[PDB]
């Protein structure tokens, strides 16, 4: 195993592929068919990068410390040529007058994730994947005993791809058209996989090639491949919780609403975060109070014409929905004081947010 590559060709791959056991902290380097493959893994997921080899090379393979190898290459001057060779149980890195000898672990000992069959495949722009994750991600549960709520649901229906996330209290659903007839399939991608799915996008020209199996997901973009194991479990039904025939509808500007709830939040209970909403003819009154008897009150002009109502909400949940929406106007759809509110951009139905209230 021998190769010489321009530092600039190694940079992005090394940055994309980078422990419980020692070898998991190493990169699997393989020279074959005039291509250098770079592989990283944590047992649950795998990232593979392929680099073209223009300069003379010799085939073979080894494993080297991931962060040490990356930091050396990144630390080298702009336009450096990196010569890599094997000399016993060590890897030799040479550029300019710099020399590095790293400790290896055998390529044979590197974990190889089992071969699997794809059931669904589709292509989509990187921007479509970025929107889907960003619109729902904040709604995923944090270390809940119900392990399934800790990931994100990826559902294919008709010609659309959907993302769903919930913690049992609040929900986020985002659907995007894909222009391909797809079968009905639902999978749970873990938190780590979602972070990696998002990490791999550069929003550029290259489309994202997605493959979904029964217990795995694969994403291809340019010369990188990302693979993750799926969450074993059964996600709840999103349709079951979207308000039925709402009799109460409110419109208001996104920024004014976001800022009024953020000011009332300061004077709410630190652990419970309860705010009181009073809705009436073209008006919203938000009130908060805490155990030390401090009080906040915000009044806004809104477009509302239904019955007068008092409903309680956790202000972190409302603000998360509003920070998530990047629009001018917001629609709130309510029924009664003990039922959920649907929050949406007033000019787009691609994303919906459902928040369950609190009694005070």
């Amino acid at each position: 195993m021998k190769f010489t590559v321009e530092r600039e060709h190694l940079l992005k791959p090394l940055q994309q592929v980078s422990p419980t056991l020692p070898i998991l902290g190493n990169l699997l380097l393989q020279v074959a068919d005039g291509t250098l493959s770079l592989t990283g893994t944590d047992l649950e997921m795998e990232m593979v990068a392929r680099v073209a080899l223009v300069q003379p090379h010799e085939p073979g393979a080894t494993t080297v410390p991931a962060r040490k190898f990356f930091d050396i290459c990144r630390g080298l001057p702009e336009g450096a040529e990196i010569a890599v060779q094997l000399e016993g149980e060590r890897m030799l890195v040479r550029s300019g007058r710099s020399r590095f000898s790293l400790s290896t672990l055998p390529a044979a000992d590197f974990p190889n994730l089992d071969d699997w069959q794809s059931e669904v495949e589709f292509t989509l722009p990187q921007a479509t994947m970025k929107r889907l994750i960003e619109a729902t991600q904040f709604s995923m549960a944090h270390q809940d005993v119900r392990y399934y709520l800790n990931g994100m649901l990826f559902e294919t229906e008709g010609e659309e791809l959907r993302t769903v996330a919930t913690d049992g209290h609040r929900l986020a659903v985002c659907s995007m058209p894909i222009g391909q007839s797809l079968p009905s399939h639902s999978v749970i991608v873990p938190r780590k996989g979602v972070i990696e799915l998002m990490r791999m996008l550069d929003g550029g020209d290259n489309p994202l090639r997605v493959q979904i199996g029964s217990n795995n997901i694969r994403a291809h973009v340019g010369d990188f491949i990302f693979t993750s194991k799926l969450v074993d479990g059964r996600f709840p039904d999103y349709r079951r919780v979207l308000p039925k025939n709402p009799d109460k509808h409110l419109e208001a500007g996104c920024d004014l609403l976001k800022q009024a709830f953020a000011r009332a939040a300061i004077l709410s209970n630190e652990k419970f975060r309860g705010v009181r909403l009073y809705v009436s003819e073209n008006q919203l009154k938000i009130t908060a109070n805490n155990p030390e008897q401090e009080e906040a009150e915000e009044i806004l002009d809104v477009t509302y014409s239904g019955a007068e109502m008092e409903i309680g909400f956790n202000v972190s949940y409302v603000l998360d929905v509003l920070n998530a929406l990047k629009c001018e106007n917001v629609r709130m759809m309510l029924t009664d004081s003990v039922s959920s509110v649907q929050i949406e951009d007033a000019a787009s139905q691609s994303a919906a947010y459902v928040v369950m209230p609190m009694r005070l």
Partner: peptide, 5 residues
């Protein structure tokens, strides 16, 4: 706090 379910 109430449940969605």
């Amino acid at each position: 706090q109430a449940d969605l379910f």
